């Protein structure tokens, strides 16, 4: 799109690695350095996708 197309989503930030051919569907909020952001604000707790 000229100035849109925000539905094509991917991963640019996450902490843990996954093993070869391992299965994962998670989309949970990321931690904030401190204890994680359970549906609330924090330091950054940037989104997975």
């Amino acid at each position, epitope marked *: 799109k000229v100035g*849109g197309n925000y*539905n*094509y989503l991917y991963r640019l930030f996450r902490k843990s690695n996954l093993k070869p051919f391992e299965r994962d*569907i998670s989309t949970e*909020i990321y931690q904030a350095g401190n204890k994680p952001c359970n549906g609330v604000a924090g330091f950054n707790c940037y989104f997975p996708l």
Partner: antibody
Amino acid sequence: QVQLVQSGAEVKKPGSSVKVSCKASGGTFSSYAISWVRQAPGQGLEWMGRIIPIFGTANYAQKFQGRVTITADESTSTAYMELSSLRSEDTAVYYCASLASYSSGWEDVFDIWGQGTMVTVSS
Amino acid sequence: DIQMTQSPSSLSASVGDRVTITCRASQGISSWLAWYQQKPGKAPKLLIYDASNLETGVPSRFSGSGSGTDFTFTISSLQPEDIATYYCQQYDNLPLTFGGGTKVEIKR
């Protein structure tokens, strides 16, 4: 079960910036890209508004750009739409829906629609 | 003006009729297209979300196919519950508009 809900039916007036709200239930609000559908009696689907709450980016249709705004407030778990310069064509059953079909492996088809309301703007 | 149209405004047919009806647009596309069914003032049904693809809930009576500027909506049988309208909407680009569709009634 996932579900979205707007507030009770109400009246909207032109010539001002009105604040419309609707909540999402089932998983964090940040997980779904929310789309607003002004389904009219004759016309069907709409794309006048799409917002990804956590990235904060939003796009609108050529009919609504410039004068509208969307704001997501996770404190109360709500997504807001600032609407202004209304026309008489707005008589439609409004829904705020989930366009979250990117993690599904399917290219952005709508899956969950809210209960929606019959907005009252006409005479 | 990317818009699709139908030719028999009021398509009439009895229960169990073979119809190969078409939705034509000014520009042809190979993807990002779907078809719906809808009542007056009610949400649309997710009948055909992709080219020649049928999703869950669709009866065997209806099916879709085609290519280019024209797409064929195949009807092996028209049930009496089908007092409704079809649509041939596209979502390829940003400046979108909705289709016109066709009206359906049961020949009696």
